[PDB]
Every structure is written in structure tokens, then in C-alpha cells.
């Protein structure tokens, strides 16, 4: 007997039971299996991390209706700036990958339905940053460590993403005051988690004011490495009635004692002040503010596709069903 007489819904069942390499095997059995082997139901979540890859493969794969694309530490360094057809991709992690800037652009120029994106540690460009503006439905965006874009392209992206909740725009070693100013002046008021650490002399107190004025919903605020900030900034954090996580690690102008004032912020649940607090005055600070969690955490979780080890492929909670592990 033949199984090709099996309903289309059932072959997909059988195929859903196949791991990535198996699925690509079967796709070459008969023309029918090949169609089905690429059915959208089978490709919602894809995990290709650390895979060297040609842009056409990433495009051809993203063109199969892939919603969660986990692909950090990957390699895409060749021609054909995806233009494939628009992509359904909603959650995508390309963090710390090496991707030709024109390849990065081509792929993100077929994206409008992104909800959660990570481009952490990727050289970008206005062409790239501008195409991101299309994804106005962006809820979480990570551009930490990125560079290659003006404060103007950053402006239209931030202006455009009006429902942004988490924004990790830290250590963009690439930029000036103007980028920081644009940043606080156009981040959506809907923002609740913002990471703007890494801009020493380029982040003034006034930039903190603007931010505080325009964004009353901040719950997470990382300002580590804000060399300019003194305790006279605390009066701005006080005007945030939902701030429960603050980071001021390496803010050398914040006298360790003045840190006691941060007890004014009622909602505050955790404080991170590494590198400026003597072990001693730190344990006294913990005495005084027993409600807080001081220097309890080292890494930012703001807009991070994944948090942990052995816990990969949980790209924003999604356990990618197709992988290469």
C-alpha cells in the first residue's frame, strides 16, 4: 500500500515529529512531501545559532512563515540582501552574530511584523535603522552595542515604535550626546524597561530629566556608567512612581553615602551600584534599606532574547521546535 494516500493534515503530523535535519530529508522524497515539508505550521520557531549561513538560506527559511527566529552568534557574510517577500517573523534574535551590513538590511527590510528583536553587537546603518521603523508594533528591541547609525535614524525608529515596552539601547559605542538626547526625547512613553548605560560624558542630568518627564512608566532603568550623574539626579528618579529596578554601577560621581537617599523611591525593589560602593558602606546600605536588593545582579535582562545557560532556545520564552543542537 502507499501512504501518499494519507490526508494532508496527517503527513504534517508525522512531519511535526521530525527534527530539522529529518524534515529536510523527507522534503526530497516526492514532490508532495516537499511542499508539505515547508508548510508554515512546521516552521514557526527556528533555532539556527552559531550556524555559518548564506543570506539566501536565511531568507528562504524566513519566507516560510517563521515567527520565532533564534540565530545568535551566526555568520551571514555574503551578497543578496534579502528581499525575498515580506516575512511573518515576530520574534528574532540575531545578537552577537556577524552579518554583512547589506545582508542585515536586506532581511530587516522584509520585516514589519516584529514584536521582539535583538540586534545586539551588530554594526548597522541608517538604511538598517530606518527599515526597523516599519516594525511599529515592536514591544522589545535590543540594540545594545550596535553602531553605524545617526541620531536621526535613531529618531525615526524611536518615534515610530510607539508601543515599545523594553528598550536596551546601551553601549552604542558609536555615539554622541545627540544620540543620547534623541534617545530620551523620542523613546515611547509606553516604555517601561530602558537600558541606556555606557555613555559617560554624553549623558547629562538634563537628559535624565527629559527621560523622566516623557516616560513616567519606567519600571527598569539602567544608567550604569553615567559618569556625569551625581546624587542630585535622585530627585528625578523620585518622580517615577513605578521604578522598582535601578542601576548606577560605575557612576563615579555618585558619592556612596548619598545612595541612602534612594530609599525615598517607595516602589524600588533592587539597586545595582557596582564599583562605587565600598564593601563596608555597602553592607550598611543594605542594613538601612532592607526592602532593597543591592548589587544582587550583574547582567541586564532588559530586552534579552535569552537569560541563562543550558536555557538557550527560549528566545523570549519560545522553545524553538526546530533546531540543530
Amino acid at each position: 500500500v502507499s501512504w501518499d494516500s494519507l490526508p494532508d493534515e496527517l503527513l504534517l503530523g508525522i512531519f511535526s515529529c521530525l527534527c530539522l535535519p529529518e524534515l529536510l530529508k523527507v522534503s526530497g522524497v516526492c514532490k508532495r512531501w516537499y511542499r508539505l515539508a515547508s508548510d508554515e505550521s512546521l516552521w514557526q520557531t527556528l533555532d539556527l545559532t552559531g550556524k555559518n549561513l548564506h543570506p539566501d538560506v536565511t531568507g528562504r527559511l524566513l519566507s516560510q512563515g517563521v515567527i520565532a527566529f533564534r540565530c545568535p552568534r551566526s555568520f551571514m557574510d555574503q551578497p543578496l540582501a534579502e528581499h525575498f517577500s515580506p516575512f511573518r517573523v515576530q520574534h528574532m534574535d540575531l545578537s552577537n552574530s556577524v552579518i554583512e551590513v547589506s545582508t542585515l538590511h536586506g532581511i530587516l527590510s522584509q520585516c514589519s511584523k516584529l514584536q521582539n528583536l535583538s540586534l545586539e553587537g551588530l554594526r548597522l546603518s541608517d538604511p538598517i535603522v530606518n527599515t526597523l521603523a516599519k516594525n511599529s508594533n515592536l514591544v522589545r528591541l535590543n540594540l545594545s552595542g550596535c553602531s553605524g547609525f545617526s541620531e536621526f535614524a535613531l529618531q525615526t525608529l524611536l518615534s515610530s515604535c510607539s508601543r515599545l515596552d523594553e528598550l536596551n539601547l546601551s553601549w552604542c559605542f558609536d555615539f554622541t550626546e545627540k544620540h543620547v538626547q534623541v534617545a530620551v526625547a523620542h523613546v515611547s512613553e509606553t516604555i517601561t524597561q530602558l537600558n541606556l548605560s555606557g555613555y559617560r560624558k554624553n549623558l547629562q542630568k538634563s537628559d535624565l530629566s527629559t527621560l523622566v518627564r516623557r516616560c513616567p512608566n519606567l519600571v527598569h532603568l539602567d544608567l550604569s556608567d553615567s559618569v556625569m550623574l551625581k546624587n542630585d539626579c535622585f530627585q528625578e528618579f523620585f518622580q517615577l512612581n513605578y521604578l522598582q529596578h535601578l542601576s548606577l554601577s560605575r557612576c563615579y560621581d555618585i558619592i556612596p553615602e548619598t545612595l541612602l537617599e534612594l530609599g525615598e523611591i517607595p516602589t524600588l525593589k533592587t539597586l545595582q551600584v557596582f564599583g562605587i560602593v565600598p564593601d563596608g558602606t555597602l553592607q550598611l546600605l543594605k542594613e538601612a534599606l532592607p526592602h532593597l536588593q543591592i548589587n544582587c545582579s550583574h547582567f541586564t535582562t532588559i530586552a534579552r532574547p535569552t537569560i541563562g545557560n543550558k536555557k538557550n532556545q527560549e528566545i523570549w520564552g519560545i522553545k524553538c521546535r526546530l533546531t540543530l543542537q
Binding site: L10, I14, F15, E22, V26, C30
Partner: protein, 137 residues
């Protein structure tokens, strides 16, 4: 506590209402119709007896029992996947599909066509592209 099922070819099996309920199909009928000899025109007596057996084994629910259970010819397995689907029994539809999945694993596209007997719709030039489109993996 009891319900009678009628195979598409005559047989009447008396299964426990709770076990028969494992079938969304048989479940909707026993409600939206309140029938005694539940008409199952899409499942013959051989397969239904299997479905009931599998459901009984997992009345509280790849295991070894299931593997031995699905240790049948391709025909029967093909009939069960349909049966399970028709009767919409997610439980048994899962094991049967994974069973077929396990059969495909290891075998090459050719060995697969043999077993499940599949016509090669491909052109040697198409298998050339299908292959190229899957090198990256």
C-alpha cells in the same frame, strides 16, 4: 457507564463511556445526539478494536507497550492514523505519527519511497535543487 460503538462493517463493541469519551468525535455524538449504537462509518471492526485497546491501556493517560502495540504492518498503521484522526484521539494520533516518524528516521529518501511506497514525482534536476536548498543544514 457503558456505551455501544458500531464499526463501519457491523461489529458492536461495548466500551466504557469514559474511554469512548477519549474520542472527541465519539464524544460530540454521545452528547449532540444521545445515540446508543454510536455510528462509526469511518472505522472498521479491526481498527476500532485497536483504538479501544489503546485507549483502554491509557484510560488514565514511546512506551514499550505502545511500540509492541504499533508493531503492525504499514497498512494497519495507516488505518490507525486515519482512525485516530477520524475519531480525533490526540493521544493515539500522537504515538502513531511518531511511530511513522521513527520509521523515516535513518532511511534515505529512496528507502522511504520503498517502505511507504511513494511515487518519485521528482526530476533528477529537482532533487538537485532540493539537495542544494538543504546543504546549509
Amino acid at each position: 457507564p457503558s456505551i455501544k460503538l458500531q464499526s463501519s462493517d457491523g461489529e458492536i463493541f461495548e466500551v466504557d463511556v469514559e474511554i469512548a469519551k477519549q474520542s472527541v468525535t465519539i464524544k460530540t455524538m454521545l452528547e449532540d445526539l444521545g445515540m446508543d449504537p454510536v455510528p462509526l462509518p469511518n472505522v472498521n471492526a479491526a481498527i476500532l478494536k485497536k483504538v479501544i485497546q489503546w485507549c483502554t491501556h491509557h484510560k488514565d493517560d514511546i512506551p514499550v507497550w505502545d511500540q509492541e502495540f504499533l508493531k503492525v504492518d504499514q497498512g494497519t498503521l495507516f488505518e490507525l492514523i486515519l482512525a485516530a484522526n477520524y475519531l480525533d484521539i490526540k493521544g493515539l494520533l500522537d504515538v502513531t505519527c511518531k511511530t511513522v516518524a521513527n520509521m523515516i528516521k535513518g532511511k534515505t529518501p529512496e528507502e522511504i519511497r520503498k517502505t511507504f511506497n511513494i511515487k518519485n514525482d521528482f526530476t533528477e534536476e529537482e532533487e538537485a535543487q532540493v539537495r542544494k536548498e538543504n546543504q546549509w543544514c
